[PDB]
Design a binder for this molecule. Structure first.
Ligand SMILES: C[C@H](CN[C@H](c1ccccc1)[C@@H]1CNc2cc(-c3cnn(C)c3)cnc2O1)c1ccc(C#N)cc1
Ligand SMILES: [Cl-]
Length: 329
């Protein structure tokens, strides 16, 4: 027995678990258990502007070469019949106040994962929502002004965090997923945490973006790849001399409009408040941990040790083995 509670605490983990546990005590369903939330990885990294954008905007001195962020991995656990189950995982990128524009004071959710056995089932969505809303409230309080979600569904073919999901864990279709995020965000608005939210196209237009260098540039996100493909397309075109008598931006706006419902921009701090904030100071220390850096290490260790999250039983066993790995290391 190495319970989840034994892992080192953080201000972030504590704030999230308090919000969940408080919510659950309000509901007072007899099936629910205590929820533990632990940050198991935090390190400092940079996202590099890829070759095409570098040539056009970095090399000309118009855009930073890379953007510093803090990556965090965290997990939520539920005690079920006296035994911790890992049911939720999240990886985020946090761009602080010392980050050059356009990434300044922005959080991006890299990946969400879950193992759908939260007990009771009827509170499962609500709990997921409380974690996400809590995360937004927490980073708002530190002074992050904007959250960013890429709201596409996972593939059976490529596990985000947990190796081997339940065969009957249901992957949403795009429109259902988008509605899930809106319901979460609507609750956040009603709690006066999120001021408002927009699709990326409406957000860009209102900020009067005119150059791609002004678009937030996140590690592994859709938009850096779009820009690389667009730039390649543009530089492939030749044309002959004319007779006597912003393409990039136009392509960007076109692609943004086409895909707008997938990409959410979440305004946490609005209007004058946003202009005169103090520095962002994160009270939590770095947490080196090779196992929980990126995704491949933990997926590798689960593959190699035949751990699965495909049933409650197996998921509890994998939880236990994971926790024992996190202690020993
Ligand atoms: C808060 C949760 C997050 N759930 C994740 C998630 C991330 C991003 C988008 C959706 C889901 C996971 C990601 N991976 C995944 C795999 C499978 C799977 C793989 N093989 N098989 C047979 C099933 C089923 N559900 C998953 O949801 C959550 C749960 C439900 C919704 C909805 N709607 C949203 C978030
Ligand atoms: Cl010709």
């Amino acid at each position: 027995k190495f319970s989840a509670k034994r892992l080192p605490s953080t201000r972030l983990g504590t704030f999230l678990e308090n919000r969940v546990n408080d919510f659950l005590r309000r509901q007072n369903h007899p099936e629910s258990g205590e929820v533990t939330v632990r940050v198991v990885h935090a390190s400092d990294k940079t996202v590099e502007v890829k070759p095409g954008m570098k040539a056009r905007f970095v090399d000309s001195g118009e855009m930073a070469e890379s953007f510093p962020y803090r990556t965090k991995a965290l997990f939520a656990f539920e005690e079920i019949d006296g035994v911790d189950l890992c049911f939720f995982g999240m990886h985020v990128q946090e761009y602080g106040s010392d980050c050059p524009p356009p990434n300044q004071r922005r959080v991006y959710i890299s990946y969400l994962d879950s193992v759908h056995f939260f007990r009771p089932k009827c509170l499962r969505t609500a709990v997921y929502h409380e974690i996400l809303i809590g995360y937004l409230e927490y980073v708002k309080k530190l002074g992050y002004t904007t959250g960013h979600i890429w709201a596409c569904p996972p593939s059976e073919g490529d596990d985000y965090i947990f190796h081997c999901h339940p065969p009957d864990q249901k992957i949403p279709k795009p429109k259902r997923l988008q509605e899930w995020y809106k319901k979460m965000l609507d609750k956040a608005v009603s709690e006066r945490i999120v001021h408002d939210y927009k699709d990326i196209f409406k957000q860009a237009t209102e900020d009067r973006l005119t150059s791609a260098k002004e678009l937030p540039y996140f590690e592994g996100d859709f938009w850096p790849n779009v820009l690389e493909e667009s730039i390649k397309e543009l530089e492939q075109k030749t044309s002959k001399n004319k007779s006597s008598l912003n393409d990039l931006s136009q392509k960007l706006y076109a692609t943004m409009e086409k895909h707008k419902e997938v990409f959410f921009v979440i305004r946490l701090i609005a209007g004058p408040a946003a202009n005169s904030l103090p520095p962002i100071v994160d009270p939590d220390p770095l947490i080196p941990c090779d196992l929980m850096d990126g995704r491949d290490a933990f997926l590798t260790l689960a593959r190699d040790r035949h751990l699965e999250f495909s049933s409650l039983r197996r998921a509890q066993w994998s939880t236990g083995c994971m926790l024992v790995e996190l202690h020993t290391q």
